[PDB]
Amino acid sequence: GEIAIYWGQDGGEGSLRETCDTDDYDIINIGFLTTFGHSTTPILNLTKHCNPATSACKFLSSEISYCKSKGIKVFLSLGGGTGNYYLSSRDDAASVAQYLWNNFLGGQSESRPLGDESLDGIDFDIEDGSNDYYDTLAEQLWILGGRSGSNVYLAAAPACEFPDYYLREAINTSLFDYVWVQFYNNPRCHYLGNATNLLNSWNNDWSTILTDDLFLGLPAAPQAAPGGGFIEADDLISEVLPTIKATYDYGGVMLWSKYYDDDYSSKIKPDV
Numbered sequence: 001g002e003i004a005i006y007w008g009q010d011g012g013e014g015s016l017r018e019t020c021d022t023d024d025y026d027i028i029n030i031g032f033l034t035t036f037g038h039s040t041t042p043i044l045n046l047t048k049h050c051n052p053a054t055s056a057c058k059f060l061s062s063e064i065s066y067c068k069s070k071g072i073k074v075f076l077s078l079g080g081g082t083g084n085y086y087l088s089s090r091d092d093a094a095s096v097a098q099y100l101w102n103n104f105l106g107g108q109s110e111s112r113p114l115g116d117e118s119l120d121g122i123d124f125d126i127e128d129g130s131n132d133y134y135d136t137l138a139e140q141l142w143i144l145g146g147r148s149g150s151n152v153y154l155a156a157a158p159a160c161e162f163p164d165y166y167l168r169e170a171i172n173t174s175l176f177d178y179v180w181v182q183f184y185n186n187p188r189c190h191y192l193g194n195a196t197n198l199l200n201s202w203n204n205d206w207s208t209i210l211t212d213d214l215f216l217g218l219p220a221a222p223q224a225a226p227g228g229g230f231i232e233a234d235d236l237i238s239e240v241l242p243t244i245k246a247t248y249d250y251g252g253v254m255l256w257s258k259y260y261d262d263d264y265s266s267k268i269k270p271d272v
């Protein structure tokens with residue numbers, strides 16, 4: 001199993017290089033592209049790490065390259081909890097895919113916000129706005145990968161109540177390489193008292209999607225998800241991990257977020 005973690009949304013969580021040098025993570029989701037679609041100039045938010053809009057994030061290229069040299073995949077995460085994002089049409093979806101390819105993946109633009117190093121793919125953390133055309137965005141990114149002979153991984157971050165309003169259509173394309181289901185901030189399905197509802201959601205609902213790797217998404221500390229869902233490490237190891245590992249496409253655990261992961265991933269990694 002693998003551990004994926006989100007990075008970008010707290011300037012004190014350490015550098016991307018330091019995050020990779022924990023050797024705890026196999027995938028880094030860099031969040032967030034908070035404005036895109038509907039003919040906007042997209043906006044990337046890396047909080048206080050660096051300002052993308054004034055070209056002060058190009059240094060990240062060297063750290064991305066270093067992370068990748070260790071076998072770590074690095075994705076750009078679309079969306080997040082606060083933003084001005086949505087797609088207005090099929091053509092808008094194709095235009096955003098091209099923007100992502102040219103600016104973050106293997107293409108060229110007039111100025112790439114994170115420098116020349118290509119990221120490995122795109123994480124769909126769609127939490128608000130219209131749900132339309134994310135299936136088309138995934139399909140157009142898949143085509144762009146095929147046209148240039150490059151791996152473009154597609155990942156999705158739905159919440160645990162199935163089906164997810166924002167991402168059900170995208171996930172139903174069957175094209176996502178990774179889906180990390182967020183079992184937090186929803187007491188209908190997250191860990192609460194015990195793992196029964198979580199495991200029922202996992203086994204009965206999320207098992208039915210077509211993805212190559214299905215991940216259990218969790219908060220790294222209680223403070224990471226005030227709405228609930230944190231599982232103490234020993235309970236995760238004894239009550240949850242051995243059950244979900246029986247699922248054929250179990251891929252690991254996703255953690256929100258680096259800022260809150262003081263020792264959670266270190267405590268769980270041998271059992272993931």
Ligand SMILES: *[C@@H]1O[C@H](CO)[C@@H](O[C@@H]2O[C@H](CO)[C@@H](O[C@@H]3O[C@H](CO)[C@@H](O)[C@H](O[C@H]4O[C@H](CO)[C@@H](O)[C@H](O)[C@@H]4O)[C@@H]3O[C@@H]3OC[C@@H](O)[C@H](O)[C@H]3O)[C@H](O)[C@H]2NC(C)=O)[C@H](O[C@@H]2O[C@@H](C)[C@@H](O)[C@@H](O)[C@@H]2O)[C@H]1NC(C)=O
Binds near residue numbers: 192193194195196
């Ligand atoms: C996983 O966690 C779930 C969430 O906590 C558990 O579901 C909850 O389980 C509790 C305990 O059974 C349910 O509360 C009960 O509700 C009935 C129906 O109203 C009450 O009659 C009952 O009260 C009686 O028993 C109490 C001792 O437990 C006595 O103190 C009381 O005076 C009565 O004699 C009890 O009510 C609770 O009483 C204690 C209070 O602190 C508390 O405020 C009060 O709620 C609760 O309804 C239930 N919640 C839900 C959403 O279902 C779950 O427990 C198991 O699974 C569920 C599906 C049911 O089958 C439960 O009966 C069962 O215990 C637990 N699952 C596992 C596998 O651990």
Ligand SMILES: *[C@@H]1O[C@H](CO)[C@@H](O[C@@H]2O[C@H](CO)[C@@H](O)[C@H](O)[C@H]2NC(C)=O)[C@H](O[C@@H]2O[C@@H](C)[C@@H](O)[C@@H](O)[C@@H]2O)[C@H]1NC(C)=O
Binds near residue numbers: 045046047082
């Ligand atoms: C990057 O994302 C941050 C988190 O969403 C933004 O901070 C948030 O901005 C809100 C206004 O849009 C504000 O109400 C929130 O309190 C604040 N949250 C936190 C944790 O700071 C940030 O916005 C910029 O920074 C804040 C502090 C204000 O100065 C805003 O006016 C700024 O736009 C986002 N950065 C950018 C460039 O959008």
Ligand SMILES: *[C@@H]1O[C@H](CO)[C@@H](O[C@@H]2O[C@H](CO)[C@@H](O)[C@H](O)[C@H]2NC(C)=O)[C@H](O[C@@H]2O[C@@H](C)[C@@H](O)[C@@H](O)[C@@H]2O)[C@H]1NC(C)=O
Binds near residue numbers: 163168169172
């Ligand atoms: C994923 O897409 C499928 C189509 O490619 C959906 O199944 C189709 O759902 C239609 C309306 O819900 C229904 O009229 C069609 O008969 C059906 N097509 C097939 C080939 O089954 C599917 O919807 C889910 O699955 C079906 C079987 C029903 O149970 C729906 O209620 C479900 O939502 C889509 N899955 C999701 C999670 O959206």
Ligand SMILES: [Ca+2]
Binds near residue numbers: 108
């Ligand atoms: Ca280049």
Ligand SMILES: [Ca+2]
Binds near residue numbers: 235
């Ligand atoms: Ca416990």
